[PDB]
Design a protein around this ligand. Structure first.
Ligand code: PAR
Ligand code: MG
Ligand code: MG
Ligand code: MG
Ligand code: MG
Ligand code: MG
Ligand code: MG
Ligand code: MG
Ligand code: MG
Ligand code: MG
Ligand code: MG
Ligand code: MG
Ligand code: MG
Ligand code: MG
Ligand code: MG
Ligand code: MG
Ligand code: MG
Ligand code: MG
Ligand code: MG
Ligand code: MG
Ligand code: MG
Ligand code: MG
Ligand code: MG
Ligand code: MG
Ligand code: MG
Ligand code: MG
Ligand code: MG
Ligand code: MG
Ligand code: MG
Ligand code: MG
Ligand code: MG
Ligand code: MG
Ligand code: MG
Ligand code: MG
Ligand code: MG
Ligand code: MG
Ligand code: MG
Ligand code: MG
Ligand code: MG
Ligand code: MG
Ligand code: MG
Ligand code: MG
Ligand code: MG
Ligand code: MG
Ligand code: MG
Ligand code: MG
Ligand code: MG
Ligand code: MG
Ligand code: MG
Ligand code: MG
Ligand code: MG
Ligand code: MG
Ligand code: MG
Ligand code: MG
Ligand code: MG
Ligand code: MG
Ligand code: MG
Ligand code: MG
Ligand code: MG
Ligand code: MG
Ligand code: MG
Ligand code: MG
Ligand code: MG
Ligand code: MG
Ligand code: MG
Ligand code: MG
Ligand code: MG
Ligand code: MG
Ligand code: MG
Ligand code: MG
Ligand code: MG
Ligand code: MG
Ligand code: MG
Ligand code: MG
Ligand code: MG
Ligand code: MG
Ligand code: MG
Ligand code: MG
Ligand code: MG
Ligand code: MG
Ligand code: MG
Ligand code: MG
Ligand code: MG
Ligand code: MG
Ligand code: MG
Ligand code: MG
Ligand code: MG
Ligand code: MG
Ligand code: MG
Ligand code: MG
Ligand code: MG
Ligand code: MG
Ligand code: MG
Ligand code: MG
Ligand code: MG
Ligand code: MG
Ligand code: MG
Ligand code: MG
Ligand code: MG
Ligand code: MG
Ligand code: MG
Ligand code: MG
Ligand code: MG
Ligand code: MG
Ligand code: MG
Ligand code: MG
Ligand code: MG
Ligand code: MG
Ligand code: MG
Ligand code: MG
Ligand code: MG
Ligand code: MG
Ligand code: MG
Ligand code: MG
Ligand code: MG
Ligand code: MG
Ligand code: MG
Ligand code: MG
Ligand code: MG
Ligand code: MG
Ligand code: MG
Ligand code: MG
Ligand code: MG
Ligand code: MG
Ligand code: MG
Ligand code: MG
Ligand code: MG
Ligand code: MG
Ligand code: MG
Ligand code: MG
Ligand code: MG
Ligand code: MG
Ligand code: MG
Ligand code: MG
Ligand code: MG
Ligand code: MG
Ligand code: MG
Ligand code: MG
Ligand code: MG
Ligand code: MG
Ligand code: MG
Ligand code: MG
Ligand code: MG
Ligand code: MG
Ligand code: MG
Ligand code: MG
Ligand code: MG
Lengths: 124, 138
RNA sequence: AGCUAGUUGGUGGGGUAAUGGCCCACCAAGGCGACGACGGGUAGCCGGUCUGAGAGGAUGGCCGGCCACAGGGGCACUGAGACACGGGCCCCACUCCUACGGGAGGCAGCAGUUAGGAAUCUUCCGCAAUGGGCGCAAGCCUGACGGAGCGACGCCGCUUGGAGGAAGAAGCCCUUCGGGGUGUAAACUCCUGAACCCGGGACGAAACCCCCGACGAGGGGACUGACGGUACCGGGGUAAUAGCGCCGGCCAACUCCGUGCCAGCAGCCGCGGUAAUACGGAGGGCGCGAGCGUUACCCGGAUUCACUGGGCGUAAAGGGCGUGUAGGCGGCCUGGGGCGUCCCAUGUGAAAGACCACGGCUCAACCGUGGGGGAGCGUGGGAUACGCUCAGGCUAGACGGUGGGAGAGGGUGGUGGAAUUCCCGGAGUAGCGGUGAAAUGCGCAGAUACCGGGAGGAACGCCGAUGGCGAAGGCAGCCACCUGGUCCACCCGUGACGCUGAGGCGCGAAAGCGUGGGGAGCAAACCGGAUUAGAUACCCGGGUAGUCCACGCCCUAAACGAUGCGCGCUAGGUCUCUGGGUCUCCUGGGGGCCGAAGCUAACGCGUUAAGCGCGCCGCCUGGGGAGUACGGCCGCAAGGC
RNA sequence: UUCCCGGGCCUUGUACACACCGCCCGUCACGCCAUGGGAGCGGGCUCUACCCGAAGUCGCCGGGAGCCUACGGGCAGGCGCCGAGGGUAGGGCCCGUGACUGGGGCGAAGUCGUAACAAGGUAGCUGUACCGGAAGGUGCGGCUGGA
RNA sequence: AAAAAUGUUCA
RNA sequence: AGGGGAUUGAAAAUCCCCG
RNA sequence: CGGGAGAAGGGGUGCUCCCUGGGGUGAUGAGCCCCGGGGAGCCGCAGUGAACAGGCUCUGGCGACUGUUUACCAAAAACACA
């Protein structure tokens, strides 16, 4: 593109899309679990990943993943959506912040616990 | 029809050189000779001289090259490995006295037109002036 | 994508502190817009802040400056100043009070409540200092301010100890069963001593006020501390919190067990299917540490919107081609102006922040003082190479003249022969046809094959090429008329008149469409016959629109060299079409091959560039979604842009 | 040595490479998501017009009525223009939602056939046109990225 | 100048 | 529909057997 | 694309007085008629003050349309029509 053209047209700034619309650029968004099923892996995996749809504050309703082993979310559990795609399940673009609201931390996790909201146990 | 005669002169030079030629004839132009004079006054070419191809006045420009080389591609290095016009007609390039270029960390030159004559990246700087950054060689 | 009635201007008024359609009469019809008017959306602006090597990109929270607003809307009054947050009037919404007869309120002041949200504090002390209002002053007010409180939210400082101590407890983990690791780590021994305890205790505060002089200048006297009995100094003085993330690669850190494409992990690549350094626990290790992680958002890396700093022959990207408007760009020489450009001086560029020193709190974080830099913009003086401009001149660019050339360039009118099909006539008989093989089909009602006569349509064999013409699409029998472009020669004329080209206008294969005409051959669809598992196909026999012409639409394409146009520069060899010459050769125009330098990711390109350069246009920015949807414009429709 | 099967080297084409026992297309079925059209239904922003029209400013008047006077005049009150908003009407722009309907994306091992890659077993592709379960077939014309 | 279709998933 | 045997590298699919 | 259009939805209309622009015949000046325009002001419930004088819109079916028809029960979606 010649200068003269540049003078006319000019370069166009990109502007990218939110890899996750959790509303008002919010660290997190709350909401109720409308449903709690159990979908299946993508391309080369096999298993029963646990997913849950959620009615967000913002009149929104979306699928959120659930971490660790076992849990306790029901058809009407209040929960916190964190925002983390699960590249292996089409759609799932948000994780549920464990150990918050109706979300129960992980029982007996001893390793990484900051993630999974597990309280620091005593060794006595 | 030649939009920028100067850029041409350089190209004519930049080509004749790339093949190792005795001299080249760029069309007559006072302002052109300037870039020439300077080009030589700085030792880039043996020199030049006016001629005439049937009422058509050109300028013989004698090229200076290096010594033959040892090994494959015994092609002699050149005095001018690089010439390129700066201020083009499609985008005039002006510079203030503090804006003058530092061609090839000093080894290079940067001919340019000024209100008070045609000087180089040093000359003009010494005169402490400015003007159309015509180009740069080295 | 067009907008506009106070709309643009005018004379005279009205209005104001004042200019002005700010307003009102009367008059004139103007005013703005692709340099983006008008309209929709979104938004307080800057100083700065964040990132970047920079250019840039993003941003406008604290503090400073400008504007705007005080539940929503309008209006004035008072006044130096307001259309005035804690003044007034009215309308509206909302909440409240009530003796149900009427009235009241306006936290976007401080603090606090509720709602919402992922989430953001004490209904604190004090006017002692600074600043502000009134007063002669004493002094009154001051949720401004000065301090304190709450939250690892941030920055900075600091502690959980220091020196010894085994060829090395225990426990726990590995183990080739010897041993190895945690590990000087611990215990243990010495010393220091955060916390806590007692004692002393601020700077910030000198003015206003009182006396002398004059109530001035100068000198002397006195009061005042929220924070606070806190900082800080001195004495005594106890070993006195550690956590989080990670360890397949990128990326620093590995072994055992459990589990068995389960459970689960996961930033991208990926891991788990019975020996997992990737899941879960453990021993160990790496990282950072009163923090460590996670999610969100900005800059970077991303030369990934490319001015710095990219591209389009096959990777995404040249417009189907042309003509040309605006616009962008422009040969050589001489002189005048000096707008761009450049230099000097001067104004400006608040403070804060940013950078350099130096000092103040034990350091730092904060903070003070001094210095140094700032684009931009104004004014004054000056320079004239380059761009601009006016003026004078030139002939290398461009255009013209006289004279000739080649060509399927285009349009109209006419014309020739070969072949196919049908019609009539003759002659003649058992099949012809078609195929891989067949069948359908045609034929004793006389076909095929052969001859003669005739009608009509469409295409033009040999020449013909690896050629020629055209801007592209495309153009072929022959002839004449009408007409375009292009090439050479002669140095004759003009004198930069040029290149490009948004928009616009024109042309634009085939298929398709409209009105009318024509119709032999071929032929989507269609119908039969075969093939096949099926055969809505390939093969066979039939067959309509169409293919043709006139006039008018549609406007697409592998509209391809998949290569925009113009000009300049950079080895040759070869064959070929065409032009000129004191013609084994020289020189001009075009088409092919091979190839210098050089270019390219490679293939290849290579004076017919994709080489080295300049001007201008067009266009690209991962794959799918999709050349789709919507809107607009065009079309009769199919559809197109 | 034609033909079936297998094997050598040279060559050509290639979209294959746990390599033709390869690869791969589209319809169909099932599941999840967004999304177009849609009789319409709901709300937000705005424009135009006329009807009522507060407060208030300004302009008249202040007459046969009132109040004040230092007789000039002032106030009250009357009328008008402007006017927030309110009403009625007819437009414009955007958002939501809607029976049903259209395609599109993605989802370990479901159905049907074989279009494409080797003359891909009728070169392929492509604009158009008709047609068919589906890929696709064919007609005209074009290109080589085919011979 | 060729009769002949296809061959589950992850490794 | 799950589980078990055969079968696989492990499935899918396919064959036999259960309240 | 003519049209949907009288779309819808509104406002004005009487009387008196003042100034003023062009027309026709005169004659170029005056009466005489002909179309306007601008200001004030008066009266009533009401000014096309009586009489003549459209209600409108959205949305389906059928038939293109103006037409024609069963004189005396059918005027149509029937007949006709380019
Ligand atoms: N990416 C698929 C898009 O849709 C179509 O593809 C769709 C279908 O053709 C395809 O269906 C395939 C079928 O083709 C193939 N022969 C058998 C296969 N089992 C089916 O599979 C489908 O359904 C199963 C559940 O039954 C899903 O688990 C699977 O993910 C899905 N692809 O599934 C696709 C949707 O996931 C187009 N043909 C394709 O070109 C286009 O890109
Ligand atoms: Mg799969
Ligand atoms: Mg896997
Ligand atoms: Mg993430
Ligand atoms: Mg005035
Ligand atoms: Mg004022
Ligand atoms: Mg105005
Ligand atoms: Mg005026
Ligand atoms: Mg607006
Ligand atoms: Mg705003
Ligand atoms: Mg950078
Ligand atoms: Mg910056
Ligand atoms: Mg960027
Ligand atoms: Mg920005
Ligand atoms: Mg800014
Ligand atoms: Mg912010
Ligand atoms: Mg501020
Ligand atoms: Mg307001
Ligand atoms: Mg409020
Ligand atoms: Mg208000
Ligand atoms: Mg006052
Ligand atoms: Mg006030
Ligand atoms: Mg208040
Ligand atoms: Mg109350
Ligand atoms: Mg009472
Ligand atoms: Mg009352
Ligand atoms: Mg408050
Ligand atoms: Mg709250
Ligand atoms: Mg809440
Ligand atoms: Mg005070
Ligand atoms: Mg004070
Ligand atoms: Mg120690
Ligand atoms: Mg040991
Ligand atoms: Mg041990
Ligand atoms: Mg050891
Ligand atoms: Mg350890
Ligand atoms: Mg001590
Ligand atoms: Mg003190
Ligand atoms: Mg005092
Ligand atoms: Mg004193
Ligand atoms: Mg005290
Ligand atoms: Mg002490
Ligand atoms: Mg001691
Ligand atoms: Mg201890
Ligand atoms: Mg790792
Ligand atoms: Mg490592
Ligand atoms: Mg399991
Ligand atoms: Mg982990
Ligand atoms: Mg095991
Ligand atoms: Mg093992
Ligand atoms: Mg194991
Ligand atoms: Mg592990
Ligand atoms: Mg990008
Ligand atoms: Mg660039
Ligand atoms: Mg390609
Ligand atoms: Mg391409
Ligand atoms: Mg193209
Ligand atoms: Mg042109
Ligand atoms: Mg121009
Ligand atoms: Mg100047
Ligand atoms: Mg400048
Ligand atoms: Mg200065
Ligand atoms: Mg400063
Ligand atoms: Mg210091
Ligand atoms: Mg300073
Ligand atoms: Mg400077
Ligand atoms: Mg001249
Ligand atoms: Mg003819
Ligand atoms: Mg014949
Ligand atoms: Mg026939
Ligand atoms: Mg006979
Ligand atoms: Mg016959
Ligand atoms: Mg040609
Ligand atoms: Mg022709
Ligand atoms: Mg001619
Ligand atoms: Mg001449
Ligand atoms: Mg002359
Ligand atoms: Mg055409
Ligand atoms: Mg045609
Ligand atoms: Mg048709
Ligand atoms: Mg036929
Ligand atoms: Mg046929
Ligand atoms: Mg059959
Ligand atoms: Mg078969
Ligand atoms: Mg025709
Ligand atoms: Mg046209
Ligand atoms: Mg195409
Ligand atoms: Mg081509
Ligand atoms: Mg040639
Ligand atoms: Mg040719
Ligand atoms: Mg080479
Ligand atoms: Mg080549
Ligand atoms: Mg040449
Ligand atoms: Mg050559
Ligand atoms: Mg290239
Ligand atoms: Mg172009
Ligand atoms: Mg994308
Ligand atoms: Mg995309
Ligand atoms: Mg449309
Ligand atoms: Mg239409
Ligand atoms: Mg039609
Ligand atoms: Mg491959
Ligand atoms: Mg196969
Ligand atoms: Mg396979
Ligand atoms: Mg919808
Ligand atoms: Mg709707
Ligand atoms: Mg009305
Ligand atoms: Mg009033
Ligand atoms: Mg909708
Ligand atoms: Mg749907
Ligand atoms: Mg659907
Ligand atoms: Mg579907
Ligand atoms: Mg689908
Ligand atoms: Mg499956
Ligand atoms: Mg095919
Ligand atoms: Mg095939
Ligand atoms: Mg084929
Ligand atoms: Mg065939
Ligand atoms: Mg086709
Ligand atoms: Mg069909
Ligand atoms: Mg169909
Ligand atoms: Mg079917
Ligand atoms: Mg297709
Ligand atoms: Mg067919
Ligand atoms: Mg064909
Ligand atoms: Mg073809
Ligand atoms: Mg073609
Ligand atoms: Mg071809
Ligand atoms: Mg091929
Ligand atoms: Mg056979
Ligand atoms: Mg199949
Ligand atoms: Mg297979
Ligand atoms: Mg399989
Ligand atoms: Mg797998
Ligand atoms: Mg395996
Ligand atoms: Mg109607
Ligand atoms: Mg109507
Ligand atoms: Mg009357
Ligand atoms: Mg009446
Ligand atoms: Mg009547
Ligand atoms: Mg009728
Ligand atoms: Mg009628
Ligand atoms: Mg009848
Ligand atoms: Mg009758
Ligand atoms: Mg009757
Ligand atoms: Mg009737
Ligand atoms: Mg009747």
């Amino acid at each position: 593109p010649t200068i003269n053209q540049l003078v006319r047209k000019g370069r166009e700034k990109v502007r990218k899309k939110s890899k996750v619309p959790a509303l008002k650029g919010a660290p997190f968004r709350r909401g109720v679990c409308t449903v709690v099923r159990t979908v299946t892996p993508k391309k080369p995996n096999s298993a029963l990943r646990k997913v849950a749809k959620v009615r967000l504050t913002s009149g929104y309703e979306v699928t959120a993943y659930i971490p660790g082993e076992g849990h306790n979310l029901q058809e009407h559990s209040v929960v916190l959506i964190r925002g983390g795609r699960v590249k292996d399940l089409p759609g799932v673009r948000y994780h549920i912040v464990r150990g918050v609201y109706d979300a129960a931390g992980v029982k007996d996790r001893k390793k990484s616990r900051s993630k999974y909201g597990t309280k620091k146990p005593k060794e006595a | 029809m030649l939009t920028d005669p100067i850029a041409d002169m350089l190209t004519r030079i930049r080509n004749a050189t790339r093949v190792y030629k005795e001299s080249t004839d760029v069309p007559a132009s006072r302002f052109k000779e300037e870039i020439l004079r300077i080009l030589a006054r700085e030792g880039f070419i043996k020199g030049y001289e006016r001629v005439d191809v049937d009422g058509k006045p050109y300028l013989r420009v004698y090229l200076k090259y290096g010594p033959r080389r040892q090994g494959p591609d015994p092609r002699p290095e050149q005095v001018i490995h690089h010439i390129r016009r700066i201020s083009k007609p499609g985008r005039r390039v002006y510079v203030g006295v503090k804006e003058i270029p530092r061609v090839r960390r000093g080894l290079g030159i940067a001919i340019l037109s000024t209100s008070k004559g045609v000087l180089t990246d040093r000359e003009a700087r010494k005169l402490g002036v400015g003007g159309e950054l015509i180009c740069e060689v080295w």
